[PDB]
């Protein structure tokens, strides 16, 4: 009968994406969103708290937000990371709010490999290719200059929510439902 419960949640048009971006979570989100588009073009609100993780789910989920019609307000909560922020940025910077105590982190993509040498030559090619794409993707939805992104992501560049706002990440540090 929590079946009847979530119908009250689903009338929220509101969404929680908390934790490590992983594929068996993106399934239940793409489940969530397409249902919301099945319902209406009405707004959607997001709250995120993530250590990033698997970029490639963060990649598609960025794209879904762009794919679909609804105007997706979002909010960053507590902290965000590489594979999670790209979702946050997937909303429009007139919609990306944030809570007054979040801390935003970016870092060049999550890499790992063994194998023969060319299999280094290949995968590394796609990594930096990913990194540059992501660094565009960030730079675009920020309005920030490209190099300034790809410079700081040499390491886990962190940002206070207020800094990221002045950076151009955020629209406003929402503090109440008001």
């Amino acid at each position: 009968i929590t079946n009847i419960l979530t119908q009250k949640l689903i009338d929220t048009r509101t969404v929680l994406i908390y934790g490590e971006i992983n594929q068996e979570l993106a399934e239940d989100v793409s489940k969530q969103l397409l249902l919301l588009e099945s319902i209406s073009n009405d707004p959607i609100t997001i709250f995120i708290n993530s250590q990033g993780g698997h970029v490639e789910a963060g990649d598609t989920i960025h794209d879904m937000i762009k794919f679909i019609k609804p105007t997706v307000k979002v909010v960053g909560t507590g902290w965000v990371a590489a594979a999670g922020i790209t979702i946050y940025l997937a909303a429009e910077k007139e919609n990306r709010f944030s809570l007054p105590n979040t801390r935003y982190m970016i870092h060049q993509p999550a890499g790992g490999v063994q194998g023969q040498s060319t299999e280094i030559e290949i995968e590394a090619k796609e990594i930096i290719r990913m990194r540059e794409r992501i660094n565009r993707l960030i730079a675009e939805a920020t309005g920030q200059s490209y190099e300034q992104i790809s410079k700081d992501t040499d390491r886990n560049f962190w940002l206070s929510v207020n800094e990221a706002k002045d950076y151009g990440i955020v629209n406003e540090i929402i503090e109440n439902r008001d």
């Binding site: 060049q108 890499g111 023969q116 060319t118 280094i120 030559e121 040499d154």
Partner: protein, 198 residues
């Protein structure tokens, strides 16, 4: 742990013989009968810097029976050969691998030998890295210099062109010796000689 046997010949000489590997050390031959890790190469290099100080004119025999190991060993043992005042014979028995063949081919020109059934496995080195991008692109750029050098090397110690080797190290381009002799990895398949007592 298992035992390394003893022998008695220098006793009969009146000089107290000893273990077997050191008996073969006295004959200037050294056994690479292990997976080539870093801590063993350091011993081999000691054994070569030792024969450097005993008689740098009396040759070396070297025995490759390695299924391979780290690249950083294949450098020092290769580089120390160039350092060593003497020449080298290297005999491929059993198996030789990515670093095994790397040194067997780096022997003294005309002294790279092996057995018929002995096996010669070659390829570009394995490796890799993990984490941030630039430190992988870095580690991608370092590894490639090594196969570059390593294939560039075995161009010189074989006379084949660089490209064909690189192509022929796309994969585990296995070789038995006679094939590898035609490829120029070795110089002869050692068989038998009669002069030792007919």
């Amino acid at each position: 742990m298992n035992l390394i046997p003893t022998v008695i010949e220098q006793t009969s000489r009146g000089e107290r013989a000893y273990d077997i590997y050191s008996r073969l050390l006295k004959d200037r031959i050294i056994m690479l009968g292990s997976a080539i890790d870093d801590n063993v190469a350091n011993s081999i290099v000691s054994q070569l810097l030792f024969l450097d100080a005993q008689d740098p004119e009396k040759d070396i025999f070297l025995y490759i029976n390695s299924p391979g190991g780290s690249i950083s060993a294949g450098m020092a043992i290769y580089d120390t050969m160039n350092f060593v005042k003497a020449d080298v014979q290297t005999i491929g028995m059993g198996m030789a691998a990515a670093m095994g063949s790397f040194l067997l081919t780096a022997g003294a020109n005309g002294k790279r030998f092996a057995l018929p059934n002995a096996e010669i496995m070659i390829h570009q080195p394995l490796g890799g890295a993990q984490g941030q991008a630039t430190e992988i692109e870095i580690a991608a750029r370092h590894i490639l210099k090594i196969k570059e050098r390593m294939n560039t090397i075995m161009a010189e110690k074989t006379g084949q062109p660089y490209e064909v080797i690189a192509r022929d190290t796309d994969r585990d381009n296995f070789m038995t010796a006679q094939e590898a002799k035609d490829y120029g990895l070795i110089d002869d398949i050692i068989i038998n000689k009669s002069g030792l007592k007919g």
